């Protein structure tokens, strides 16, 4: 809790298994298999009440998780692949937080 990214605090997830992402292309699949452990397995997010819906929560979660990971060598290909796997984890995280919020 209470994590700071880019000078803003109040960010909050537990580690998740990184799954394989299936890109529909042999080279991308092989590159992902080679590099997937360099990518995050925990996502940064903010409380669900700070968003209107899942899409906006997930947008921040993807953006900030990747920024935190890349500012703390990643190419543009790495960023694009991180966007795919981190989006899935952020969706999972949103469902966890949403269920807790509606209780």
């Amino acid at each position, epitope marked *: 809790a209470g994590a700071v990214v*880019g*000078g*803003l605090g109040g960010y909050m997830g537990s580690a998740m298994s990184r799954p394989m992402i299936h890109f529909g292309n042999d080279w991308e699949d092989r590159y992902y298999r080679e590099n997937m452990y360099r990518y995050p397995n925990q996502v940064y997010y903010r409380p669900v009440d*700070q*968003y209107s819906n899942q*899409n906006n*929560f997930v947008h*921040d979660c993807v953006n*900030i998780t990747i920024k935190q990971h890349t500012v703390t060598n990643f190419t543009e290909t790495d960023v694009k692949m991180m966007e795919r796997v981190v989006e899935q984890m952020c969706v999972t995280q949103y469902q966890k937080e949403s269920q807790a919020y509606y209780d």
Partner: nanobody, 124 residues
Framework: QVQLQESGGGLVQPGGSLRLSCAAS????????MGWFRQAPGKGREFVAS????????DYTDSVKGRFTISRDNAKNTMYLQMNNLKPEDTATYYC?????????????????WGQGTQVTVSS
């Protein structure tokens, strides 16, 4: 020391347009990322659009993309929201706010120094 106050608003017909402004005090408006939020009756403030300090990057909630345009005039210490193709769902109090930290985000917690707000009503 940068504080904010919205102007513009009022009534607009469905499909019409209007422009909101957000005037800033102090000397460093041009160093702040900025955002617009809106609060519909009985709801909390939720993201509409944001713009970086330089004006070079902007972001929008999906339901306003292509209809609303955020902009700023650093020389005049003001940010704008041009609202086109207004829909009944757009009726709300609109607030401007100063960005916290270096990254524009969509969360309500990414901004502070909220203006007092201005009202937009789509006619019915």
């Amino acid at each position: 020391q940068v504080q904010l106050q919205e102007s513009g608003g009022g009534l607009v017909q469905p499909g019409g347009s209007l422009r909101l402004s957000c005037a800033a005090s102090g000397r460093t408006f041009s160093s702040y990322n900025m955002g617009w939020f809106r609060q519909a009756p009985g709801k909390g403030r939720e993201f509409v659009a944001s713009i970086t300090s330089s004006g070079d990057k902007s972001d929008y909630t999906d339901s306003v993309k292509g209809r609303f345009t955020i902009s700023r005039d650093n020389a005049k210490n003001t940010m704008y929201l041009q609202m086109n193709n207004l829909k009944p769902e757009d009726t709300a109090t609109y607030y401007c706010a100063r960005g916290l930290g270096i990254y524009i985000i969509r969360a309500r917690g990414g901004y502070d120094h909220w203006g007092q707000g201005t009202q937009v009503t789509v006619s019915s």
